[PDB]
Ligand binder design. Structure first.
Ligand SMILES: [Br-]
Length: 163
């Protein structure tokens, strides 16, 4: 009903501008391919496409083979079957990832969701993705991600706008 609808909408409003822009990009990509559901893989592809956020900073720091991650996401994208819809919806796994990322962020005292929170949610629930090439994203624990906040705040485009 109404309360559930408004809860899902409040969750979308909590996304920072980087993550929101990427989610819109994922929805646009789904529309061009006439796919019914926006998955976390569609979102991760668009996050990496923007390539200046928390994920890119971590990839650079920990020397992830970013090309192999991108190729795995392309492979996953091309292997997805068409599922007729004039307009896409968020997949069950995406609503779950969004909700868990907010819970990760809110437990840290944050008001907004950034890509590191989506990563934190993913590392604690690896089955939210069904793409083998995403294994580097599962290498850091939530405790490690939390400790990396000063580095992310110095290098990511998702950092605070003030000191
Ligand atoms: Br990124």
């Amino acid at each position: 009903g109404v309360n559930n609808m408004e809860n899902s909408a409040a969750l979308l409003r909590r996304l920072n501008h980087y993550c929101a822009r990427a989610l819109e990009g994922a929805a646009s990509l789904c529309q061009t391919r006439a796919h019914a559901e926006i998955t976390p893989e569609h979102w991760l592809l668009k996050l990496l496409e923007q390539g200046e956020g928390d994920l890119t900073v971590l990839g650079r720091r920990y020397d992830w083979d970013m090309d192999a991650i991108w190729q795995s996401l392309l492979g996953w994208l091309d292997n997805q079957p068409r599922s007729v819809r004039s307009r896409p919806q968020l997949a069950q796994s995406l609503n779950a990832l969004l909700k868990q990322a907010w819970m990760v962020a809110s437990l840290q005292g944050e008001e907004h969701i950034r890509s590191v929170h989506l990563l934190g949610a993913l590392t604690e629930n690896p089955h939210l993705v069904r793409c083998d090439g995403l294994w580097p994203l599962l290498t850091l624990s939530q405790s490690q991600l939390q400790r990396l906040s000063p580095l992310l705040d110095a290098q990511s485009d998702e950092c605070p706008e003030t000191l």
